[PDB]
Design a protein around this nucleic acid. Structure first.
Ligand SMILES: [Mg+2]
Ligand SMILES: [Mg+2]
Ligand SMILES: [Mg+2]
Ligand SMILES: [Mg+2]
Ligand SMILES: [Mg+2]
Ligand SMILES: [Mg+2]
Ligand SMILES: [Mg+2]
Ligand SMILES: [Mg+2]
Ligand SMILES: [Mg+2]
Ligand SMILES: [Mg+2]
Ligand SMILES: [Mg+2]
Ligand SMILES: [Mg+2]
Ligand SMILES: [Mg+2]
Ligand SMILES: [Mg+2]
Ligand SMILES: [Mg+2]
Ligand SMILES: [Mg+2]
Ligand SMILES: [Mg+2]
Ligand SMILES: [Mg+2]
Ligand SMILES: [Mg+2]
Ligand SMILES: [Mg+2]
Ligand SMILES: [Mg+2]
Ligand SMILES: [Mg+2]
Ligand SMILES: [Mg+2]
Ligand SMILES: [Zn+2]
Lengths: 110, 42, 122, 53
RNA sequence: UUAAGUUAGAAAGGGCGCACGGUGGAUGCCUUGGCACUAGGAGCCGAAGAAGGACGGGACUAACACCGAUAUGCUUUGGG
RNA sequence: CCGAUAGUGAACCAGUACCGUGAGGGAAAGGUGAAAAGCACCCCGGAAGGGGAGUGAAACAGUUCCUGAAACCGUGUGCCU
RNA sequence: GGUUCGUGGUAGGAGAGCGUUCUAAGGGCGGUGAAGUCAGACCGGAAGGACUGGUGGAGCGCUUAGAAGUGAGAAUGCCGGUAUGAGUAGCGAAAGAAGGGUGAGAAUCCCUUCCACCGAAUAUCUAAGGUUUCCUGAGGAAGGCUCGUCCGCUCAGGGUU
RNA sequence: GAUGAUCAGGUAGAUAGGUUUGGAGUGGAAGUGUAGCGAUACAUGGAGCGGACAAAUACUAAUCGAUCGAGGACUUAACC
């Protein structure tokens, strides 16, 4: 019926992935891929590979029609955070969260 | 100009093994670091 | 006129560099803001070229970079950007009033999202 | 200088009502048959949709 | 049709409820390690070079353990 | 008597790492499964990572992998705005 | 068992209890699913206690007594995790440009040309100090305030007469 | 005009750039010639240059697309 792909622990902040994933949620996969191609954000290429993986899964594992697919679900979940430090003035160090994302895309017929 | 202006010689002359051994209190220090089980005496 | 995030002298250097690149290569890829400034400067150099006389050649020479375009061979003598502007480029726009350049929009650059364009002679 | 109170979830979410992207301005080409930004050159065909290069 | 009046519906976003995930490592269960003792033993090592180390030794060896240029072991007596 | 924030500082290569000129100070960090049977092969991807297929009692047990609370982050939507 | 009078309450006195870990004895539950965990519209005067279902995958109640590391919301408490501020401040003195190349991918790596900057130095030695950072070949998780095909980074080999 | 917005335009075209002709402004280009030993002067010639100002000109770019956006509740009165 539907096909999912996930990109786990991608080194991009979830907020930055979500602002893009919100454009493709509900679109036909052809339009979704165009939207990602012409959205100049660092998340666009990453989300494109998850979406094209989901479509390949739908065509190979579940013999679905790639011409009739819609993005049923798309969401970003928090992955494990890398903890870093930036030296600041007066010997003080400030925390830096190098956040990671789990990016899920589900495609379905209609 | 910061404290800590390194010198190989000054480090060993002030804090080295032979300087520690040269005084009774120096030997107390070695004995204490052996007792605690330090990898590095002196 | 555009300040292109540069001081006065830096901006004159940039314009001279790009103007020469467009005369030498005839098609270059750059940022939209740079292309919209280059069309003004290159079209004036081509106008000088069309005027053709020594006074115009020397006005162009004050602007165009001293770059070798090619080595042609008769002995083999180099061809300078100024010579290309007065002998190759200018003569091919002899019956065209202005509008010697065109800007094709390309798309944003990966590292800074800068809107890139092709600017070309024609 | 500093926040007097932490910002609630609701208030944070209201502030972000306008923090979003717009869809790109695009359309299907005739010669290519695929999407392209208007007033841009289409790489699928490899030139400007109308003016051949 | 005009007039006067009444009432619906709406969600850019938000709230409550529910469902499903993510993160995180609490809880339970577990134990390689500890803690306190009892009974017995033993209470010293060193110029015949100690305690503690450094550097080495393997077919390849970074670390640990073991060993000392006879170096990842040698002789012998027993066990098996 | 303790049962991993406890019990030794130290269940794990700990007086280590790290800090300090030095004396000295001094951590964090346990659990796949009965067994590696540790995922052939196919697919998307440069890889990571996934989806199948297979193993297994279980893989929502997938090399840090028993359980997996709460904060916190999201998707969906019954009622309200 | 009735009658009568009572039952606001801080410090504080008095009483009766709930629940937690462990022990003993008795009696049980449990792979036909223990503890834990999640959910619920159930029960008791309270502390609290069941039942049913999901998850979990091996231990645990109950009765009576006993013993305590026995109950947390506050200590600018300690440790850990995660928010808020916020896609905000910042990205650490400076001149770049285009063409060609490489590559899955290039403002950022390589090459070319022009431009620009230092030049009693921003050049050449060399002591200290550092200790392999040097060279070559691979790499692109992390590090690099962006990117990265690159690197004083990772992995191998080498190299000092 | 911070950005949004506003306003002028998008070939049903002067919206911007170029081009042509002007203008302000500067003050006499280069080249050549003449005079001077020379510095220089004079002539050619209010010359040459001339961001942002003016008018003409479709040469270049405003291509090609897409998206959103009514179908009009009930009650009563008055005409009708
Ligand atoms: Mg400092
Ligand atoms: Mg130091
Ligand atoms: Mg200057
Ligand atoms: Mg401990
Ligand atoms: Mg635990
Ligand atoms: Mg500890
Ligand atoms: Mg894990
Ligand atoms: Mg009363
Ligand atoms: Mg009372
Ligand atoms: Mg009392
Ligand atoms: Mg228990
Ligand atoms: Mg639990
Ligand atoms: Mg207590
Ligand atoms: Mg607390
Ligand atoms: Mg602010
Ligand atoms: Mg600001
Ligand atoms: Mg800023
Ligand atoms: Mg910098
Ligand atoms: Mg000087
Ligand atoms: Mg090197
Ligand atoms: Mg980076
Ligand atoms: Mg490299
Ligand atoms: Mg006009
Ligand atoms: Zn096309």
């Amino acid at each position: 019926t539907s096909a999912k792909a996930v990109a786990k622990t991608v080194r991009i902040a979830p907020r930055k992935a979500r602002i893009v994933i919100d454009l493709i949620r509900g679109k036909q996969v052809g339009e979704a891929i165009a939207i990602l191609k012409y959205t100049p954000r660092s998340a666009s290429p990453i989300i494109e590979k998850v979406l094209k993986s989901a479509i390949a899964n739908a065509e190979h594992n579940y013999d679905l029609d790639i011409n009739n697919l819609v993005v049923e679900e798309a969401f970003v979940d928090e992955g494990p955070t890398l903890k870093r430090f930036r030296p600041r003035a007066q010997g003080r160090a400030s925390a830096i969260n190098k956040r990671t994302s789990h990016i899920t895309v589900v495609v379905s017929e209609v | 100009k910061r404290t800590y202006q390194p010198s190989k010689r000054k480090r060993k002359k002030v804090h080295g093994f032979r300087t520690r051994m040269s005084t009774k209190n120096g030997r107390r220090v070695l004995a204490s670091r052996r007792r605690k089980g330090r990898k590095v005496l002196s | 006129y555009r300040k292109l995030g540069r001081t006065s002298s830096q901006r004159k250097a940039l314009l001279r560099d790009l103007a020469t690149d467009l005369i030498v290569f005839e098609r270059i890829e750059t940022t939209e803001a740079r292309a919209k400034e280059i069309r003004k400067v290159v079209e004036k150099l081509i106008t000088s070229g069309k005027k053709g006389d020594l006074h115009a050649r020397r006005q162009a020479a004050a602007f165009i970079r001293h770059e070798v375009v090619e080595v042609v061979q008769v002995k083999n003598r180099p061809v300078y950007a100024l010579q290309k502007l007065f002998d190759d480029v200018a003569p091919r726009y002899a019956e065209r009033q202005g509008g010697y350049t065109r800007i094709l929009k390309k798309g944003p650059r990966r590292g800074d999202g800068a809107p890139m364009v092709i600017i070309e002679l024609v | 200088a500093v926040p007097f109170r932490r910002t609630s979830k609701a208030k944070k979410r209201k502030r972000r009502t306008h923090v979003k992207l717009q869809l790109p301005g695009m359309n299907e080409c005739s010669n290519c048959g695929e999407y392209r930004l208007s007033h841009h050159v289409c790489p699928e065909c490899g030139q400007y949709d109308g003016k051949d290069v």
